[PDB]
Copies of this chain bind each other. A is one copy, B any other.
Amino acid sequence: HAFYVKVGLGQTMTAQDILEGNMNVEIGLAVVRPAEFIILKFSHKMQ
C-alpha cells in the first residue's frame, strides 16, 4: 500500500530501448501529510 517498484523488458522497456542502451525504473510513493485543520463535530444521540 505504501510503494511500488517496476523495471524490466515488457514492463518499462521495449527491445528497441535495449539496443539504444536505456534502462527505465519507475517508483511510486505515498508520503504522510500533516493534519492542518481539525474539525470537531458534536451531536445529540437518543437515550
**Residues in chain B near residue A47, CB distance under 8 A:** 9, 15, 18
Whose C-beta in chain B lies nearest to the C-beta of A47?
A: B15
**Residue A46 at the B interface, CB < 8 A?**
yes
Give the number of times this chain occurs in the complex, counting copies: 2
Complex interface bits, A27-47 against B, C-beta within 8 A gives 1, otherwise 0: 000000000000000000011
Spell out A's residues near B (CB within 8 Å).
Answer: 9, 15, 18, 46-47
**Residues in chain B near residue A9, CB distance under 8 A:** 47
Instruction: Kindly identify which residue among B15, B18, B46 contacts A15, using a CB–CB cutoff of 8 Å.
Output: B46
| 4 CB < 8 A contacts A-B | A9-B47, A15-B46, A15-B47, A18-B47
**Residues in chain B near residue A46, CB distance under 8 A:** 15
